[PDB]
């Protein structure tokens, strides 16, 4: 509810001291956006050389272990991606200490709607709600100034009728789907441009941030291109090349493709594993696989030349890469492939597509790495976080490729198993919504991570619906290996075929909390996201039955 | 001979719009097959060629040598109209 620059000067005044400082910025959690945000944030701190702690939090339940344990001198705290949904004032408590409260916890979140207790009643925040939903948002505005603090019998009856009158519309709010408005990174950059830093790798961090989520919607991002492209116009390494030159040597616009790993993998394998194209061409089917080859017969690209790594393909095919696709792809309905994208060239190393980089980092997060076992695993993910954090750095590229050799493999897993599902037609159309469960599969170790099931769930909800009449219906998935029937189950959102009228607001967040409040059968919201929960095989089936009814949508 | 060129004008007609088993041109589907497989062997049944005309079948039992060279260039023409490419393939 504040100016970004002024919130900045506040976090400046409470910061620098002897001993320095102290602030812990919480990077959270598994979302690439977090990295994108906190890296340019951390670089900004290093600019004024302000000491910082930075914590890799996984579990939402895990945050309590930290904040309740170690705090001493820390008068100014910062947090990322948490608290937009569940309020930490009740969750942490707080317990006001010393107006002009000593500690300011900044909470940065893209999630909506905000918790009601957060924005109004200033204690721990210093909210980041600005500027996306301001709004009004008159529904939260009347939620308090009316409620607080609230012949005489008719005035009591009138008063109470008014109270429930506000409580109904208030109940409409805060019970709703969790949907990201704008990427937190973008706003950190809006905060950053007011201070005056135009830095190139910074901007690349923004591009990374925005393009973190294009796998899932945009939704506003379709109109974020002005806010990026203009900035790309606010700077330039040289008016003209001047090949290369070995330095600056920076990012530029190119006809990029939702196509998967075009530059770091072989072309044919790049269609065959791509996510958008899995769908339209029915590639899980042997009968459709051929249709790809017909694409190549249309392009005049040899099959043998399609099998070869993209660095080494002939030059003629490169110069025709932006034409041939226009000549052909239009006929297959694949006409939405070509985006205007961002590509940063490091020169003699190669170039990297904005999206593919994100595929590298995601790749890093799950691989390349009774409560003791889950804690130890979540711990392994915590360590792995930094292995992924390092790849963002420019000076070490040598491990970034270790991401990509993984990012390929994962797909080779994901695709494979994905097909293993469609052969058995495991989709349960049900009535109100679509649902699935993986009872058996190869290498569930890869599927342990929330984000792995976010991407498999994504290629699957993308595959089932082209569309593909009728009625985009949200999907459900489940997997188990070890940790005694943890059976991780993540919520999902429907995918429109590039024509998106409504955000549609994932409802699993609410539907799960209704069940935690009913019989709560081995239901665990331990994962940071409201869409993803844990379950046991003993209680999963009654849970599934209680999921089927009553349907909130 | 140049007269033989006119023969091509006939055999191309045999190459695409010829049908059998209630529609669904077979040789069109072979060209489509390679085609995708791009195995560069187009395959023509002698039964059908002899079914349309015995005059060409007689040319196969007299002088296959130069006639295959006349024929396969036209096959390349048919693949050319069906897939406006393979100037780069074979």
Swiss-Prot record, chain A:
<dbReference type="InterPro" id="IPR003874">
    <property type="entry name" value="CDC45"/>
</dbReference>
<dbReference type="GO" id="GO:0000727">
    <property type="term" value="P:double-strand break repair via break-induced replication"/>
</dbReference>
<dbReference type="GO" id="GO:0043596">
    <property type="term" value="C:nuclear replication fork"/>
</dbReference>
<comment type="function">
    <text>Required for initiation of chromosomal DNA replication. Acts at the origin of replication. Also has a role in minichromosome maintenance.</text>
</comment>
<dbReference type="GO" id="GO:0005634">
    <property type="term" value="C:nucleus"/>
</dbReference>
<dbReference type="GO" id="GO:0006270">
    <property type="term" value="P:DNA replication initiation"/>
</dbReference>
<comment type="subunit">
    <text>Assembles into a complex with MCM5/CDC46. Interacts with MCM10.</text>
</comment>
<dbReference type="GO" id="GO:0031261">
    <property type="term" value="C:DNA replication preinitiation complex"/>
</dbReference>
<keyword id="KW-0131">Cell cycle</keyword>
<keyword id="KW-0597">Phosphoprotein</keyword>
<dbReference type="GO" id="GO:0071162">
    <property type="term" value="C:CMG complex"/>
</dbReference>
<comment type="similarity">
    <text>Belongs to the CDC45 family.</text>
</comment>
<dbReference type="GO" id="GO:0003682">
    <property type="term" value="F:chromatin binding"/>
</dbReference>
<protein>
    <recommendedName>
        <fullName>Cell division control protein 45</fullName>
    </recommendedName>
</protein>
<dbReference type="GO" id="GO:0003688">
    <property type="term" value="F:DNA replication origin binding"/>
</dbReference>
<dbReference type="Pfam" id="PF02724">
    <property type="entry name" value="CDC45"/>
</dbReference>
<dbReference type="GO" id="GO:1902977">
    <property type="term" value="P:mitotic DNA replication preinitiation complex assembly"/>
</dbReference>
<keyword id="KW-0235">DNA replication</keyword>
<keyword id="KW-0539">Nucleus</keyword>
<dbReference type="GO" id="GO:0003697">
    <property type="term" value="F:single-stranded DNA binding"/>
</dbReference>
Swiss-Prot record, chain B:
<comment type="function">
    <text>Acts as a component of the MCM2-7 complex (MCM complex) which is the putative replicative helicase essential for 'once per cell cycle' DNA replication initiation and elongation in eukaryotic cells. The active ATPase sites in the MCM2-7 ring are formed through the interaction surfaces of two neighboring subunits such that a critical structure of a conserved arginine finger motif is provided in trans relative to the ATP-binding site of the Walker A box of the adjacent subunit.</text>
</comment>
<protein>
    <recommendedName>
        <fullName>DNA replication licensing factor MCM2</fullName>
    </recommendedName>
</protein>
<comment type="similarity">
    <text>Belongs to the MCM family.</text>
</comment>
<comment type="subunit">
    <text>Component of the MCM2-7 complex. The complex forms a toroidal hexameric ring with the proposed subunit order MCM2-MCM6-MCM4-MCM7-MCM3-MCM5; loaded onto DNA, forms a head-head double hexamer.</text>
</comment>
